[PDB]
């Protein structure tokens, strides 16, 4: 044992338990609890009683649910089920109808609040000259308003960013208060029986005009043809001579389409509004603007609300060509003669982000949906024009639905869309169970806000009725498992491919990754913390003292927990032998040894919440600020502490002085997952880090735990079939179920975690554990200060939500609740887990529960059917945080045995859910039971052999503009998103289309279509084609998303003039990019506690730190990890430079893999693809940098550190080590046997420390060697030829 080990052990022994303070501050913890728990063995009789009761309950529930009482035929049972489903649906609909002040059935509100106009080009520029000389007619208030506007323009009274500053007749629509009242009059809920016929008409209809690309429509975003041509020339110089390839050709064709023109128009509207809102220059005036080179005019007003912007659109009659569609879906307009005008429209500041990215998102969505149904991605628009099959209609329908939901961008619509997943997954339930889709009826939104929601609800109701009437039919022959009767949840048309169906289910995920707040309507978050707290038992007798007979919320059985612990210990003894305890001890010691201050010292966030912020009145003006972990961790390390454990004890003492958690909350405004964030203090962070480290250490030993063994997640299902065939020794039958927990986060008490953790650890860790858990028994959560500011001055009748009423009454002292206090600024809670702050421990608890239920399932099969079947059946677990899955496989030779097996498997599936209660594992309605050859886990679906994923989840994510910083940073993160989507199961051609979308978005970001000056910029950037100036690099279409930004840069430098610039740096100014690019683009004071110091001791960069100052150096290096003017400045770079392979080697250490890919993907010309036949098995494959001959015996870093410092971690022969060193030396010319000579000779230490890259490993899912992957994964409709 090293010095670190012995000193850590000595310190840990120095930590001691203080029972008095813990008992006093934290009620439910006591010496007697743990003493009795460790001493008393579990009550076998009680366990047997509860197991028998669960068996009886499961049998009764199965009999009653499936209507086996009379032994009726399938027909009558299904009729009864349909009757029940209809009754439930009618109940929900009537409950909706019971509301008052319902919106009238005919009061149509357009889902899209924009005109359907489509027009030609006009005079360029942003000037308002075209307004002059227009004779507008009409009498509508907007007609008169725009008449005044044109009169002022003719009189040239418009100021300058043009400001109208109109006078009389400016009121009666703008009284500074009218409009904000008007759009406030849209609070009436929508009836379920509202007329929504026009939505259905628009969605599914003979809509072919949408895809006719002619007439020279307005298209401001088609001015970058030369740039795309140059980009294509990089990879396909021969083809580029002829012209654009297929992908760019169809991209520009889609630009030229009617929908393309409209999408570009709306995107320009979004960008213009986003620019306008930043001005805030009008005293009390209006601001008028004109779109670039078009007859579109926007009359804009921001109000005193500072959260809504009011717009009025106008178009010249002479320029207006026609309308995209005459349906009510779009905002109706008013004729005024020379002009067509619409009414004022209010927009929230959040939607503008969606508006700007409309065109790219829609190109992506349409391409993906066309690809999913079999239409080639690179040739779809024409196919959409000649709609001749159900596939084309379905694709168009889904694209239009994406349009509607994106333009509506309301969360409730997204949840309604996502519910379809669980609605339709019910159709795979095999006998003896029957599908119960109607059980999701309780998940509908409380209120209806839009016509689109009504239409979606009606579609969902029809789908539920249809599914409950008749499940999907199975078809088995010669190992060719298949299903029949599937249909789209929304359109209702038949389907035959799993992938489009799953994509339909997951359509509600359009992650845009907005890392900001969301003040409006966040009470639900707070509500989500309270709903269970009031249900806490008044007595703690069932929180770890005794065993409840009928468990309630938050209660659990001590004896069952101890029995599960004993069973898990027995399993571990069987697996790892008798000395498993000491192995665990060594593992945890090793894990804590490597738990340094540095690894926690990441940006993330921290809460400065102390007692100073308890009273709202004291702090009303000071703005709360979230500190970074960096400063606090650095301050702690400056004291001279190396390991994060070192500062545990003292830190907890501070917490013990506080006696409560000091958590703060954060709501992300992104429309998807991980909205909840529980930011938490430094001392809490260190303690929780220790606890989670030990939890993960203990849990790693269990194979079935996916969290601790991510490889096992993909390993287990694939090997399941092979193991089943080996064991059963013949044809097999598989049953399965996927389950999700109900109120997992706020349903758990904390004592059980401490108990079970102590059962698996030696006594010396006990004080570390019981203390570290007790701090969760009382937690105070801050709220948003603006929320309280609003609440204080809101008086009564705030909102109909009872939670807000209760909070208001408690804050003013009118009412008393245990989760709030008068005049305070926090919610106090005794239970909870704060959304994954205690993550590994929960997984361990789930793991042990599943091991016990596995044993019980073995017993049940042995009992109910035949004694000896345990020797010839397979059972498999999968668990994570809260999602779980159960797999069972048995021989399928005898029909009677097969039926008995199915009955027993259903019984065991119900057993798991029923018994989960005793450990406070509450099953959710989302769980699906007894589905044959169907399995779900983390949204990954396993339809027998096929393994499918919801690729759409990553589509919308690929289109975003976060992280700003440098342009090259933006491009490389775009490449990262491309890698993410392609590894998600998409085809390469679809990836190329997404890259085109990203290209157009990125180019319009610099102002393409916004400012005339962009035309000058194009003139310059073309000459130098440097990404540092914003030039976008299109990857080779055949292998886009695989080679990545490194491939793009390598190809660029290989032949283009760009290399001449890089050699200029080898012989405004900024440093190199992480990708290696010498870019140019266009806190530290607080960390007062270095390059020369690192140079003096490079070993710091090559080993884990053991002292303070080195930790400071490591965090320090972690911290430091105009356009016309700039092109004018570049005129001085006339230095004559040439090629140099050594510079390429320095920039790219992995040249061999890059050229290997190049040898296949370079200059492939046109595309010829042979269509495939039916479906094939999905096979995992290793693709890139798999070889080790060129990648050396071990990593270059290991060899360098062994040579310079003798770390002897290479574990190779001495002569082998010398040979490896010599071959590296001939690889690396400037590498020397000493750090000093190497530093002097090479053309600081950090820059040459990380140049050893060793890129990551990539795996792909082929559908039957890099050539194989590229030929079989370019497109899903076929495979390449000649490769």
Author numbering: 214 to 373, 412 to 1318, 1337 to 1351, 1364 to 1370, 1374 to 1405, 1451 to 1572, 1579 to 1599, 1608 to 1626
What sentences appear in the manuscript?
pmcRift Valley fever virus (RVFV) is a mosquito-borne phlebovirus of the Hareavirales order (formerly Bunyavirales) that causes severe disease in humans and livestock. The replication and transcription of RVFV, like other viruses in the Hareavirales order, are mediated by the L protein, a 250 kDa RNA-dependent RNA polymerase (RdRp). The L protein contains three domains: endonuclease (ENDO), RdRp, and C-terminal domain (including the cap-binding domain), organized in a similar manner to the PA-PB1-PB2 heterotrimeric complex of influenza virus.
We determined the cryo-EM structure of the RVFV L protein in the apo form at 3.5 Å (L proteinapo), which resolves the RdRp while leaving several peripheral regions flexible. This apo structure aligns closely with the previously resolved RVFV L protein structure (RMSD ≈ 1.05 Å), with positional differences located in the vRNA-binding lobe (secondary binding site and template exit channel) and in segments linked to dynamic domains (ENDO and C-terminal). Both the RVFV AlphaFold prediction and the SFTSV (strain AH12) L protein structure indicate a loop in this region, whereas the prior RVFV model omitted the loop and threaded the sequence into a neighboring helix, producing the ∼20-residue shift. The catalytic RdRp domain (resembling the PB1 domain) contains the conserved thumb, finger, and palm subdomains seen in SFTSV , and La Crosse virus (LACV) , L proteins. In the RVFV L proteinapo, the finger subdomain adopts a more open, inactive conformation than the replicating state observed for SFTSV. The ENDO and C-terminal domains are highly flexible and unresolved compared to SFTSV and LACV L proteins. ,, Together, these features show that bunyaviral L proteins depend on RNA-induced conformational flexibility and structural rearrangements.
